[PDB]
């Protein structure tokens, strides 16, 4: 859903808008930066899109986009270019200009592109540059500092300068500048990282039509141009389809896979070109071409399909630059909470005005001091503290091996209620492994041998070690992981082809028949010194190989045992051999036909190779299931294999039931039918394929929510189906995590609320969350860090509120008696104590164990608001007790009410209130810092503990030892010592009361709230569905 609105230019309206906004006030600019639709409507006049000079885009969010003309009228929205099609009278994305053209069109453009036609297509498509818009420091400062929060901070600096509070104005300016510098640091870091990541400039030879070859810069490429690649290979500058030749490509920079992939020439045909259907033929921008072979012609040719942001790397970089806004509002009723604090602030302000009038202070000073009191509850350090929290979260994850490109996405980790896991690579080992081999003795299968190394030397061992199609590239075996795994299992070393015994003669490959997808098998011709005649070894599908084998060799237990292996999630391949009476020689064996070798075999043994589960998978799955976080396995593999892995990793514990949901296509004469297939070894899981999922999505919208709620295994799903599944689960107000490492999981990881990729680098682009570890242990780490981040940000907001209300009460108490909190005392409180403690509060890390209780999501919660109100009650009580206790002292002398502060400073009332409140800031900071369930205990934070200890020591020095900082801070020297001990006892009483109140609330109050008002329901659609299914189970 996108809406456009073309606005043609007009000078008089623009100059009128300019003068009105500039001269009238700054409020219109604020409401425009809040609601820009009114601003653009006033500034510029709506008109026909064909006459647009400045568009408006809605997606609901508003962007305004200039239109540029070159005659080509184009604009750029979020990197992508849209051009003015005159015939269609619309703006079409250049990503779809040649979309749909067939492979024959690509092979026709193979000859290249005319230089003039290249020039026009470069005007259309733009340069082949993923240009990250870098901003200068003045531009970044303007973008940051013009926040209305910093505007209010500057206004407050003006008010405090007016009241001759120079030190406090300097404090506010320093804290605001620290906030701005932190924002600049993070923003410029991210931008520079992106720029050096996409930096790319090369000279690539392009095949100009007419037979000549042209060398241009990398940015000169346009779609439809023909590249020629170096025979040794290089880096890929564009997104091209391979038309002639083959090449090794290392797609780790794009996909994250380190293995070399075969990229072959595009198959000629009348089918539309697709980067996904023809992926094996498509070269991607940013990948590495290890080598290129020109089997036909003199050079390897590729034809450019996508340039700039159109490429896959361009799409990923755009998704990083313009991320989809986070759906979750973690701070539910944040505006209501801020208004609930602001009504208390307004009551305090009206009381301040009343008492200031009652103190007979001039009206100008009344309004100045009321404005200062209002500015008190807008803490300068709130943005700094809130950015520091996310910076610490990102640092903790990075030290754990988890990298996030959007640190605000971390809080979504503590909101996760469901995590989807791709099976292979993520839950199971990346490839198959040798669990056993099944030799024969005549017509009887021998017992399984776990390791093939100790098998006696013979035709079966040689078939295991030799019947393959390996090719030693760079002294490294490459090819089918099937073959690589079996040959490394045999222990024989590759050296046509010869093999050396691990510890017993070397064996040579006289001839080799390469594997074919249609044949389900392959064969070789093999001889060794000491052999009377060569032996031909065949490995392939057991059913087909057994037919080629002699019937008197194949045991009758063949079918039953192969089914027994297959049902257990294994993968069985058969090994057969036959003696060839041909003389052992290179020439003689090369003339053997495939039919001769494949026919008349003998069954020597079976090979079983299952995909092992990673050791870390089961503990993580059971830890997530213990936390009541749904573990869903969304795989493209077989359903039986998926179910076996799911039961093995603890997604379906043995006491649980698993129902396989099967859906029949609505063929002619009948509708679509759902049938449920129960199987034997919250407690009822469903297993269904991709076809079944699509059938249910189309024809069964009523039963789809229940399937999604109690569906655990999702096998045989295509990547579009994985993305659809993630979206459908999110439609039930799940917070879905996706932990697929694969490249095919790209859409699901982009769609999911938390998308984690397992084996990546520091600079990976595949998903918002990337990890370096191969195990799914990064998922509980992300969840623990997200819960810690949510708890930490809640504690920081609570401390900011408590902070602010405490200082507000102190200023009110001092206003009542016609004094104030003094200049350097504001500086000390707001900078030395509060900013330090607030930016060190968030440094403590997540709890070491994931627990069932979830962090809250409502800032105006009864627990949070009750905590704030009951902490402020005790703060006000302690300060007023201290003030009413210093009055009772005999040495006390009332302040000079005639003058106004700071003229009457130092005075005993200011001294007592400053001392008490300064201790209360540290007390509240320690009180809001909860540990378990979501964080480590407070003392594990050594900077925070050192700050609390040193600041408490400095405050105790201020109270006790005379003459220390009592000159600058303007503290009256209290001679009495029993009174100092009484004040310290009042501070200790407040410190004990704050922690006891926090403990009592945390323990009792949830129980009291549940007993008082049991929740009628839960707003979440999935929880409603879970209760509905408990009432009446759906599959009967």
UniProtKB/Swiss-Prot annotation:
The lineage of its organism: Eukaryota, Metazoa, Chordata, Craniata, Vertebrata. It is a multi-pass membrane protein. InterPro entries: ATPase_P-typ_cyto_dom_N (IPR023299), ATPase_P-typ_P_site (IPR018303), ATPase_P-typ_TM_dom_sf (IPR023298), ATPase_P-typ_transduc_dom_A_sf (IPR008250), HAD-like_sf (IPR036412), HAD_sf (IPR023214), P-type_TPase_V (IPR006544), P5A-ATPase_N (IPR047819). Residues 33-144, 186-336, 394-793, 842-857, 933-943, 1002-1036 are cytoplasmic. This is Polyamine-transporting ATPase 13A2. One of its GO terms (molecular function) is ATPase-coupled monoatomic cation transmembrane transporter activity. Changing residue 413 to R: In KRS; decreased protein stability; increased degradation by proteasome; novel location to endoplasmic reticulum; loss of lysosomal membrane location; impaired autophagosome-lysosome fusion; impaired degradation of protein aggregates. It catalyses: spermidine(out) + ATP + H2O = spermidine(in) + ADP + phosphate + H(+); spermine(out) + ATP + H2O = spermine(in) + ADP + phosphate + H(+). The chain crosses the membrane at residues 145-162, 166-185, 337-357, 373-393, 794-814, 821-841, 858-878, 912-932, 944-964, 981-1001. The keyword Translocase applies. Expressed in brain; protein levels are markedly increased in brain from subjects with Parkinson disease and subjects with dementia with Lewy bodies. Detected in pyramidal neurons located throughout the cingulate cortex (at protein level). In the substantia nigra, it is found in neuromelanin-positive dopaminergic neurons (at protein level). GO terms for biological process: autophagosome organization; autophagosome-lysosome fusion; autophagy; cellular response to manganese ion; cellular response to oxidative stress; cellular response to zinc ion; extracellular exosome biogenesis; intracellular calcium ion homeostasis. Gene3D superfamilies: Calcium-transporting ATPase, cytoplasmic domain N, Calcium-transporting ATPase, cytoplasmic transduction domain A, Calcium-transporting ATPase, transmembrane domain, HAD superfamily/HAD-like. The gene is ATP13A2. Accumulates in an inactive autophosphorylated state. The presence of spermine results in a dose-dependent reduction in autophosphorylation. Keywords: ATP-binding, Cytoplasmic vesicle, Disease variant, Endosome, Glycoprotein, Hereditary spastic paraplegia, Lipid-binding, Lysosome, Magnesium, Membrane, Metal-binding, Neurodegeneration, Neuronal ceroid lipofuscinosis, Nucleotide-binding, Parkinsonism, Phosphoprotein, Translocase, Transmembrane, Transmembrane helix, Transport. SUPFAM superfamilies: Calcium ATPase, transduction domain A (SSF81653), Calcium ATPase, transmembrane domain M (SSF81665), HAD-like (SSF56784), Metal cation-transporting ATPase, ATP-binding domain N (SSF81660). Residues 12-32 dip into the membrane without crossing it. The active site is at 422 (4-aspartylphosphate intermediate). The keyword Nucleus does not apply. Mg(2+) binds at residues 741, 745.
